[PDB]
Inverse folding.
């Protein structure tokens, strides 16, 4: 069953109220094309859970483990962030992607061919992102995701591949997970749409041919200890 920290809101706040991700006691379904949740600075639509403001502390002050069995069904060319450590500012600290773009450096890296790269970017102590390819998948396939924050040393494992480094600390950091669909051309990597304008993203996803984007998470666990 889905942990109560999620289902009850004791730890996580929901972004995108409808539909609710809990489709049965053991399954989370994140569908940003339906939830269509936005923020002032966002660059797409999201359906996502986030650690609530009151519990946030420095990356170096918690031990967190998130694990999930993740199935992804998404139109060719789609790109989403399915888990991330977010900074206090607009920064990010860790991001895990499922992505069908021409961005170089991954196992596929071929735009719009239905083969999604699964990779991670981790922001190091110098403030620079390091990226690492974990695997590839086609729509409908499933993989295992494990994200660990060991007091500032962040590790991601998927498809049996692991990568981790110490990350730039942020005093009010927070973990999020779900399906944050990115409004971006997969060929050119140009962003599409206008911040805060939900209709703009509507039109972007139509033009990008993104008519399916469903992240299903099962066998989910989350632990959090603070120091
Ligand atoms: Ca591809």
């Amino acid at each position: 069953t889905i942990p109560s920290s999620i289902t009850s809101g004791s730890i996580f706040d929901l972004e995108g109220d409808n539909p609710n991700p809990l489709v049965d006691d053991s399954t989370l379904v994140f569908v940003p094309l339906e939830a269509q949740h936005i923020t002032p600075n966002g660059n797409g639509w999201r359906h996502e859970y986030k650690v609530k403001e009151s519990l946030r502390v420095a990356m170096t002050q918690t031990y967190e483990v998130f694990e999930a069995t993740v199935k992804v069904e998404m139109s060719d060319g789609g790109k989403t962030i399915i888990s991330q450590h977010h900074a206090s500012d607009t920064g990010t600290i860790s991001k895990v992607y499922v992505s069908d773009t021409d961005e170089s450096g991954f196992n596929d890296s071929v735009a719009n061919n239905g083969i999604f790269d699964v990779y991670v970017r981790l922001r190091n102590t110098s403030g620079n992102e390091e990226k690492f390819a974990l695997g590839t998948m086609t729509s409908g396939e499933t993989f295992n995701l494990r994200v660990v924050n060991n007091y500032g040393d962040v590790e991601v494992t998927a498809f049996g591949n692991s990568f981790g480094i110490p990350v730039e600390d942020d005093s009010q950091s927070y973990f999020k997970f779900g399906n944050y669909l990115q409004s971006q051309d997969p060929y050119t990597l140009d962003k599409c749409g206008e911040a805060g304008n939900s209709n703009s993203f509507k039109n972007c996803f139509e033009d990008l041919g993104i008519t399916e984007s469903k992240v299903t998470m099962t066998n989910v666990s989350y632990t959090r200890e603070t120091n």
Summary: The chain has one domain: 1-227. The longest strand covers residues 213-226. The domain at 1-227 is CATH 2.60.120.200 (Jelly Rolls). The helical segments are 4-7, 32-35, 198-207.
